[PDB]
Design a protein around this nucleic acid. Structure first.
Length: 84
RNA sequence: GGGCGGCCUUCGGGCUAGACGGUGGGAGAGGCUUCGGCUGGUCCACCCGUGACGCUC
């Protein structure tokens, strides 16, 4: 994933070398929340791994909450640069 | 929605010591498995990134 993860970081960074901004963080949660749902499909018995998903979904909503009520400009772009 | 909540400010702002992320690691009993594998937590380093984004009902 130092390939895939890093791809999205290059994609959602705010500057050459950014890896922690609210954007990159959301981009990663996003990417992570998708690769797990796709998983849960195959292994729908896994109720345990489901938990994790519940969290990342919340963790992401909270970061977004922060951004929305912090810099909408940056917000609106990030949400229409993915979905919601 | 409720309660609580970092540092400095001449209140306009400024921070990184929390939190999250990135990078590199630790764990003899996490879950599902079409057993050929997917997937959730968890602890530690840095002192790279954001910058209080936290905590609690």
């Amino acid at each position: 994933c130092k390939e895939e993860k890093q791809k999205v970081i290059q994609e959602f960074a705010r500057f050459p070398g950014d890896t922690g901004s609210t954007e990159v963080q959301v981009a990663l949660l996003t990417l992570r929340i998708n690769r797990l749902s796709e998983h849960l499909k195959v292994h729908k018995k896994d109720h345990h791994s489901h938990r994790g998903l519940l969290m990342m979904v919340g963790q992401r909503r909270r970061l977004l909450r922060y951004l929305q009520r912090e810099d909408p400009e940056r917000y609106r772009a990030l949400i229409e640069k993915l979905g919601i």
